[PDB]
Paper text:
The membrane (M) protein is the most abundant structural protein of coronaviruses including MERS-CoV, SARS-CoV, and SARS-CoV-2, and plays a central role in virus assembly through its interaction with various partner proteins. In coronaviruses, [name] is the only multispanning transmembrane structural protein and has been shown to interact with various partner proteins, including all viral structural proteins (S, M, E, and N) and some host factors involved in the interferon signaling pathway such as MAVS. Here, we present the first crystal structure of a betacoronavirus [name] from Pipistrellus bat coronavirus HKU5 (batCOV5-M), which is closely related to MERS-CoV, SARS-CoV, and SARS-CoV-2 M proteins. The batCOV5-[name] is closely related to MERS-M, and to a lesser extent, SARS-M and SARS2-M, sharing 95, 75 and 74% sequence homology, respectively.
Our next strategy was to crystallize the cytosolic carboxy-terminal domain (CTD) of batCOV5-M (batCOV5-MCTD) and solve its structure, which may serve as a searching template for molecular replacement of the full-length batCOV5-M. Interestingly, four batCOV5-MCTD-sfGFP molecules assemble into a tetramer in the structure, consistent with its oligomeric state in solution as verified by a cross-linking experiment. In the batCOV5-MCTD-sfGFP structure, the MCTD domains swapping β strands with each other, resembling a “butterfly” shape. Three monomer conformations of MCTD were then extracted from the tetramer: conformer 1 with the β sandwich split into three parts, conformer 2 with two parts, and conformer 3 as an assembled MCTD (batCOV5-MCTD-xtal). Though it is tempting to postulate that domain swapping of CTD may play a role in regulating the M–[name] interaction, further investigation is required. Meanwhile, we tried to solve the full-length batCOV5-M structure by molecular replacement using the three CTD conformations as templates, and eventually succeeded with the batCOV5-MCTD-xtal structure. Meanwhile, alignment between the batCOV5-MCTD-xtal structure and CTD of the batCOV5-Mxtal structure yielded an all-atom RMSD of only 0.5 Å, indicating that the individually expressed CTD of batCOV5-[name] preserves its structure. However, it is noteworthy that the CTD dimer interface in the batCOV5-MCTD-sfGFP structure is different from that in the batCOV5-Mxtal structure.
Numbering used by the authors:
A (entry chain A), D (entry chain A): 2 to 64, 68 to 232, 242 to 322
B (entry chain B), C (entry chain B): 2 to 64, 68 to 235, 242 to 322
The structure:
């Protein structure tokens, strides 16, 4: 689709949000850049007022899905870049479990060669003492997200991407004929007598773990290795000529529980044009929250990678 | 210590609970066996009344810590088996966050060669549409516990233990010169050119130094010292000399079906049933791993529990 | 194991070394006693020739690992005391970074009730103005070792052990409303208003996942797995079945006087002196802490050594 | 002294260095701000050429000592701010042990309200395979510096400063009548029988550690606590109307040793004016090296605190 070509390279991003939550007024401004080729997003956000009413993770989602990486086979389903350069409007309602709701309206458009995202956010009935207003959330986007980075050295340069768990792996340690596997003592066993296959029993799946590598630390001691909703669900909305998306975010609260955020969103094109009405699909998002060490004002540094499926 | 010898082998276990939660009467009876040598507990519980008003995970804790494996150096701190064969009494108060409370009193004693744990439970101020009374909990003991089993075939027989899942592992897939590491697209790379080592950058972790001592040298002058101590899911056990027993604290994060977790604040105290020299333990804790399953051919509301407890 | 019983108590030790470093002949003789129960080694060494061409820390290692304390679970891996009373032979090669090398052969055996360690040492290609021959080293075994002693009075007698200095501690000084924490000016603060907890932010540490297995699915396609293993200063000991002995590796960072450190790459191998069933150990290591002092009333070039070795 | 008043507040800093080491040409440009009140320095440096010939720690020193915090009693000895706003010239010779030398000439002056530091650096005979050119240094300024940060919450805001060791502290753990103190087993002892004072024997000082706090973990088990060249040496140089300074930097190299850097420097005022000729004293410096997480070009983020004595 024409209009996605302006996302071939890196695009500068400017985000401007004005929010008032339960009588607390604030405004956030963020700048950075997005590489739609890999789904890379590097942004820095600052509260212009100073005082932060809500914790960053609640509005991380609310704070440019056009930079989502759409693989080639579904390139005919990317509504976001097809709405560009005229842009689209994104309306969100975020219901926090045992708390109030956010209602947000944003315009994502192109100003010259920059990508501007302007938001109006309002909080309706949020408890003044709660996980939201009490900043009790653990500076984490979702509970299933590892906030770690993974650096792969390739051709002299390290490539850094968020870290997902792609499979299950269990290590076995045999000492003088006694086996300890996954923090449990399995009793007497000889290192040579370690099985080639081990089984794991999930409430629905029977997984088989095969021995990958073994190393002998002694005559009878050694080590062996055995190995084998969250996403944003997007559907089309022909009557409004846009898309409707649903998802849930489980913010880690400090006391061990999680705060639920039900995101219901709908996007409609800003100007008359032929947008791509997609099939039902989803976006997988991975986020890493850090802070600028030399920065003193209340800020957030975001690294985000989105892919489609 | 005498009285711990009765746990050298496998011991048959009988658990009997009569509960009343928000005016809902029920009774659970369970049978099985425990091997204190490995900390193994294998039991099957059935609701005799039939329909269970609260979900099984809420009562897993209330439904025999004597079978906890105490290592040799801590064998002088196992109060539970030292109270035997006369037994002890276990009083629990379970405060559920944003919900009611359980108050339970149980007697754990030896009846003949069987180990009987008899419980009276009462649940108060429970929301009828709450997670507890609504069975909204996800049939999981704790959120950090994987309810999976790990079976290792050894010497012709498979040995089954709970899954701890503490390892870290990343898989790399190179297809036609493009690399995918842990479900992410890393770009162009050749398989032979894959690096021998990869690095992971964990989030900055903040070591906490607590104020140890303070001394005031003046009206607005003084000195303070901050230091890191030598030491959430585990059951923290302390002695209670004045009552000649033990007091334990912990928290359990039950998985709620919608993705959240329900907190259960367990505050318990155990005191010996009969006059005797019990072991007054030092501060320690029990690490517990539990697996909940169901008999596919069973019709009554039931729970099959496998549990492993260790001390530290 | 038989032969380790000879180390139940304190054993008198005699060490005798004849060395030739770059054509410089010298001889060191040392006496003392070792308590294998605690890993204690207390010796006094004197250069019989008088002036020592190389500094004492270089020869501390070359100058009886049988006195290393092996815990109960590792008592089947202590090759040194298992080779006794016939003894073993210890061959060492010490490569000093940007300097020459030591080649040493020693016999550690039992002469009567004494434990004798006899050494032949040869030093080759040493810079005459180098750190070694110039005595530029700072009379320290390793740079991470504090040469301090810690004396705890217990039951009327002080017990002395080397200082490990592994704790972290920060002191706060408030003067007239201004705060100083760890030698830094933190600005205005009131002593009563001092926080209960302070946080320290350590530098980002990079966990390393090594490639465990690789399998090629095509010309430019394959799969790789990266994982973190379960496990520098310590002496790493491995078995050597083909030679029926052990081989050990380690590195020692001697403190140079100008602030730098001189590296000493120790590669050693021990083989039993007499025919017998020695213990072929699993891979393990020895953690060593040494304290070097001098007798103030002594005139000959000497060294007083206190050493504690443990296994893991 | 007049002219130090312009350092009462925060001053923007711009650093420009052109270096050629053993035929490798590069240029570094850095920007940030310095607060002379507390000695705070927050800077970010970037290699403009791309390819970094030498590791950052070697030139960290070479890359604005006017921001050094001089306490009140020695405020008559601060030559640096007394040379301002006209500035001074700083000449350095840095001899690396078992390697060549750096020769650097810099002008530290005021351009408007900004503080400009312009440097010419040249490396004479540095081994191509060495700790310097091989980037073998451990991203650490000095071996005695802990690269950690210490955050003290005061009045709702955390103050972050480099972490020094101000005293010696030893913890004792008694379990069932056996004592382990500072990673050593002292044998049998009862927790109630723990001594009030412990002694430490240094090669020159006999330190006494008193018990600070004790906590009982059981009937006979518990824990107790016992507690009790690098700097830049500056002298005056009347004949040249400036100062001469000496110091040594022990960079941690990766293999465990340290690389020595002998800094010999001299500062002379740029313009005719009454500078302060100081008594012999020294500056204590603490540095923390980090990196901007969203930054990809070869960069360094520096936090530095200097005090006088």
């Amino acid at each position: 689709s024409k209009g996605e070509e302006l996302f071939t390279g890196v695009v500068p991003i400017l985000v401007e949000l004005d929010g008032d939550v339960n009588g607390h007024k604030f405004s956030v401004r963020g700048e950075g850049e997005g590489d739609a080729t890999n789904g890379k997003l590097t942004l820095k956000f600052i509260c212009t007022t100073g005082k932060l009413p809500v914790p960053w993770p609640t509005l991380v989602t609310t704070l440019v899905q056009c930079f989502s990486r759409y693989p080639d086979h579904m390139k005919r389903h990317d509504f976001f870049k097809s709405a560009m350069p005229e842009g689209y409007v994104q309306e969100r309602t975020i219901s926090f479990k045992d708390d109030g709701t956010y209602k947000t309206r944003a315009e994502v458009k192109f100003e010259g060669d920059t990508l501007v995202n302007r938001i109006e956010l309002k909080g309706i009935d949020f408890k003044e003492d709660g996980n939201i207003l009490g900043h009790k959330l653990e500076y984490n986007v979702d509970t299933m997200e590892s906030n770690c980075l993974l650096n792969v050295p390739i051709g002299g340069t390290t490539v850094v991407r968020p870290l997902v768990e792609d499979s299950t792996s269990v290590t076995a340690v045999v000492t003088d004929g006694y086996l300890k596997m996954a923090g449990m003592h399995f009793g007497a066993c000889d290192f040579q007598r370690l099985p080639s296959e081990v089984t794991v029993a999930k409430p629905n799946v029977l997984i088989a773990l095969k021995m990958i590598k073994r190393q002998a630390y002694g005559t009878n001691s050694g080590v062996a290795i055995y190995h084998r909703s969250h996403n944003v669900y997007i559907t089309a909305d022909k009557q409004k000529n846009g898309i409707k998306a649903n998802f849930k975010i489980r913010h880690n609260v400090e006391d061990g529980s999680v705060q639920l955020a039900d995101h219901y969103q709908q996007n409609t094109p800003i100007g008359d044009g032929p947008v791509l009405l997609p099939d039902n699909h989803y976006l997988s998002t991975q986020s890493v929250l850090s802070k600028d060490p030399n920065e003193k004002r209340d800020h957030m540094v975001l690294l985000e990678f989105v892919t489609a499926a």
